[PDB]
């Protein structure tokens, strides 16, 4: 009756905090397998991406495996990159609708609670500091950090992000847009109330200038360069902009009109 669906929770998370959201697929969707993956839960969660990619591959290649019309994908915050990088690299990963639930898609750059605990003597213009180096390219956060202002190192630095992005060339860029154009939808929730990612746009691949003007998708040469076939899933009607004014971060997988509007209609 409906695919199978898996979870992929951001930051400091578990399949706790998806109770709601299970709970709105199974009123909806009577009968829908939904699998809230534990992987990566609390301050493990701090982990490089890359690990937490191959962590999540190993998981999901059996659920998708049994899937014979495919998997959908539902993907908070954090690990809306995660997934993203994840339908990069796997060829034969046969996920129909990848729903990134309020991700930094195209990075972070701004100050947080979260930032703050963590980083108590930083700013969002001081973190390149620390994220760009070796070891802070070790720690999850850091994976993303785009700071607009010192592109050079972070082109140079950043493992995760620059890499998935085509930014910085590597010798699977081909083959990884390849395999994130297998996708069959990408829906793209956000909104202009979150008040986490930074800029909040980074959900429909939009992000700050030099001047900290914040440009749309568009106008970044990640799109007209189709580094990552962004361009390709636009022109295909594969990209679904889905953006909501009334939500805070915390909310996006809490809110019954969010899933009835921008969620259930892509989980077929």
Known sequence: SYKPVIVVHGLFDSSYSFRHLLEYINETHPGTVVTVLDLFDGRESLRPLWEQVQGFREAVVPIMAKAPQGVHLICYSQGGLVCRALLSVMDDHNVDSFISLSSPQMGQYGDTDYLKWLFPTSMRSNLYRICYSPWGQEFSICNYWHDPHH??????????????????????????????????????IGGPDDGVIT????????????????????????????????????????????????????????????????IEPWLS
Not at 155 to 177: K, M, Q, Y
Not at 217 to 226: A, F, H, K, T
């Open 199 to 262: 800029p909040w746009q980074s959900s429909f691949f939009g992000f700050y200038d030099a001047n900290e003007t914040v440009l749309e998708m568009e106008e970044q040469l990640v799109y007209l360069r189709d580094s990552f076939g962004l361009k390709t899933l636009l022109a295909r009607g594969a990209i679904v902009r889905c953006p909501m004014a009334g939500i805070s971060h915390t909310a996006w997988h809490s809110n019954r009109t969010l899933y009835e509007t921008c």
């Open 151 to 188: 592109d050079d190192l972070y082109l140079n630095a950043s493992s995760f992000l620059a890499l998935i992005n085509g930014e910085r060339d590597h010798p699977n860029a081909t083959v990884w847009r390849k395999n994130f154009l297998r996708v069959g939808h990408l829906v793209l």
